[PDB]
């Protein structure tokens, strides 16, 4: 929601959703680009964190 002087305010679920969509996006961008699995593995463990 907007606070007063241009500053805003967010719950902790907004940003924690952002770290899952991008990892569900970067993993999408790796598979088509014929990536090495050592990249595809380290993408997968960041989603497991996320």
């Amino acid at each position: 929601v907007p606070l007063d002087g241009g500053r805003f305010a967010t719950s902790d679920l907004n940003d924690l959703y952002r770290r899952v969509i991008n990892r569900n996006n970067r993993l999408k961008r790796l598979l088509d680009l014929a990536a090495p699995d050592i990249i595809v593995r380290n993408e997968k463990r960041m989603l497991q964190e996320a």
């Binding site: 969509i21 598979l31 997968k44 463990r45 497991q48």
Partner: protein, 98 residues
């Protein structure tokens, strides 16, 4: 509500860390993670009994058995392989034995 497809199926944490998935599969919780974290393969369906099912196989010995059996064996690594471990077994049959 919104919904996202996941690229690979990933495990739920409240049925991992609590244990409900090792106790369900006869495996330690520490001996699950090495299969999840892309360190060690696990036997999906061993038609050949040289490796018994549910085995923590390093990448070194991974080449050793591959040349022996080719494609006649089954071994994957990751949290979709643990979906494949949960997929294989039978509820009522494995309840019959206990």
């Amino acid at each position: 509500m919104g919904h996202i497809e996941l690229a690979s199926p990933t495990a739920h944490i409240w049925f991992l860390k609590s244990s409900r998935i090792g106790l369900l599969l006869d495996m330690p919780l520490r001996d699950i993670e090495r299969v999840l974290y892309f360190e060690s393969y696990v036997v999906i369906e061993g038609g050949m009994t040289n490796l018994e099912r549910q085995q923590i196989l390093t990448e070194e010995q991974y080449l050793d058995a591959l040349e022996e059996f080719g494609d006649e064996f089954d071994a994957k690594m990751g949290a979709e392989a643990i979906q494949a471990l949960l997929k294989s077994m039978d509820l009522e049959q494995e309840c019959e034995q206990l």
